[PDB]
Design a protein around this motif. Structure first.
Motif, PDB file in Angstrom:
ATOM      1  N   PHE A 217       0.809  -1.225   0.000  1.00 41.54           N
ATOM      2  CA  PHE A 217       0.000   0.000   0.000  1.00 41.54           C
ATOM      3  C   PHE A 217       0.843   1.276   0.000  1.00 41.54           C
ATOM      4  CE2 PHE A 217      -3.549   2.691   1.897  1.00 41.54           C
ATOM      5  CZ  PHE A 217      -4.341   2.637   0.761  1.00 41.54           C
ATOM      6  N   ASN A 218       2.093   1.161   0.450  1.00 36.56           N
ATOM      7  CA  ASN A 218       3.029   2.288   0.461  1.00 36.56           C
ATOM      8  C   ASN A 218       3.737   2.490  -0.881  1.00 36.56           C
ATOM      9  OD1 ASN A 218       2.670   3.077   3.258  1.00 36.56           O
ATOM     10  ND2 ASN A 218       3.823   1.230   3.817  1.00 36.56           N
ATOM     11  N   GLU A 219       3.604   1.515  -1.782  1.00 34.12           N
ATOM     12  CA  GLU A 219       4.202   1.583  -3.117  1.00 34.12           C
ATOM     13  C   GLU A 219       3.279   2.314  -4.087  1.00 34.12           C
ATOM     14  OE1 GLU A 219       7.572  -0.864  -2.000  1.00 34.12           O
ATOM     15  OE2 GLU A 219       7.166   0.643  -3.541  1.00 34.12           O
ATOM     16  N   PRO A 220       3.843   2.910  -5.156  1.00 40.10           N
ATOM     17  CA  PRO A 220       2.999   3.412  -6.245  1.00 40.10           C
ATOM     18  C   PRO A 220       2.141   2.309  -6.876  1.00 40.10           C
ATOM     19  CG  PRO A 220       5.220   4.257  -6.457  1.00 40.10           C
ATOM     20  CD  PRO A 220       5.268   3.202  -5.395  1.00 40.10           C
ATOM     21  N   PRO A 221       0.909   2.646  -7.314  1.00 35.40           N
ATOM     22  CA  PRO A 221      -0.009   1.636  -7.852  1.00 35.40           C
ATOM     23  C   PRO A 221       0.603   0.758  -8.942  1.00 35.40           C
ATOM     24  CG  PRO A 221      -0.722   3.883  -8.403  1.00 35.40           C
ATOM     25  CD  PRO A 221       0.308   3.991  -7.337  1.00 35.40           C
TER      26      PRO A 221
END
Length: 290
Positions: A217-221
């Motif tokens: 969830f902390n990563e780019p989509p």
């Protein structure tokens, strides 16, 4: 053109103006496709929900036909009822049952659900999906934001704007449709996909209910979607806290191969759902009660 699209959409929606019978609009939320409002029925004082989607602000405009046709006159106890749809200027308005308890997202972000509560939510959603999938409807946006609650803790599936219809003649879809962190790997990999994608997404919602957020969830989509596509099924950050029953249940949802992933009808018989509490068990979770 925009006006060419508007004309076509006008043919599928209900005629007339909801502004003649609804008033006192209050914006209470916003999603990928638009906003959600409370409105009052002028004749009675009854509260309903209205979602408003701008025809010019959609990633994929053509998807606006789907919900208004597929879910017309659909009735199930665990599905939010759509009453009417209208073209109001440059917006599609959909009038729906008002779920005064809000969404599950507030709960997963601010509380720690127990397994009785988690099982209750899963049982409600699986009851909904079992019936939908049998009719060839794929939701395609299962996540906590799509689960709404009544004041007395009943659980209903909403947010059908990305839904699809499959048939004997066209049994699978190909569109890359969904919300990045919750999308099935075979959908991300462009395998003609079916109802099974909803079962994966439900697994990711179980991760929300256990961990508070989906994997990556902390990563780019885009980065997250590559990781979902390439890596093995995601692990619970809080794995050591959960029961063997919940882990075994989750293992049937987060199966990378669609053909081996459990179906909704199968999961309704799973021992984990024996833990499901009644609607009352959900009530203490909602903002107004905690």
């Amino acid at each position: 053109s925009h006006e060419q699209f508007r004309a076509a959409l006008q043919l599928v929606v209900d005629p007339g103006d909801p502004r003649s019978y609804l008033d006192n609009f209050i914006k209470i939320g916003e999603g990928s496709t638009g906003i959600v409002c409370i409105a009052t029925v002028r004749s009675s004082g009854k509260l309903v929900a209205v979602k408003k989607m701008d025809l010019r602000k959609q990633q994929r405009r053509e998807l606006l036909f789907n919900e208004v046709v597929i879910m017309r006159d659909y009735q199930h106890e665990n599905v939010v009822e759509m009453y009417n749809s209208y073209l109001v200027g440059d917006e599609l308005w959909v009038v729906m049952e008002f779920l005064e308890g809000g969404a599950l997202t507030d709960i997963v972000t601010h509380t720690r659900m127990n397994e009785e509560q988690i099982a209750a939510v899963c049982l409600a959603v699986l009851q909904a999906l079992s019936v939908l999938h049998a009719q060839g409807v794929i939701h395609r946006d299962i996540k906590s934001d799509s689960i709404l609650l009544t004041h007395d803790g009943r659980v209903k599936l909403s947010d059908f704007g990305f839904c699809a219809q499959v048939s004997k003649e066209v049994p699978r879809r190909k569109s890359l449709v969904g919300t990045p962190y919750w999308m099935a790997p075979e959908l991300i990999s462009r395998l003609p996909y079916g109802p099974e994608v909803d079962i994966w997404s439900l697994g990711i919602m179980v991760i929300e209910m256990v961990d508070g957020e989906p994997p990556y969830f902390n990563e780019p989509p885009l980065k997250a979607m590559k990781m979902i596509r390439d890596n093995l099924p995601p692990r619970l950050k809080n794995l050591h806290k959960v029961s063997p029953s919940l882990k075994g249940f989750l293992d049937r949802l987060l199966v990378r191969d669609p053909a081996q992933r459990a179906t909704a009808a199968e999961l309704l018989k799973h021992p984990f759902l024996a833990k499901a509490g009644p609607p009352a068990s959900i009530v203490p979770l909602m903002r107004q009660n905690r």
